[PDB]
Write a protein that binds this DNA or RNA. Structure first.
Length: 14
RNA sequence: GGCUCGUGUAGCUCAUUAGCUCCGAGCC
């Protein structure tokens, strides 16, 4: 179950 | 100052494949 953004416009998956 | 990236023994919610919270570093 990933983490799409990381808050105020960041980018990761898992 | 901005742009991009880090699972960080990091946090939040719903069985998902994304969005929301903060902060650190490099490059231009």
């Amino acid at each position: 179950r990933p983490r799409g953004t990381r808050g105020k416009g960041r980018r990761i998956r898992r």
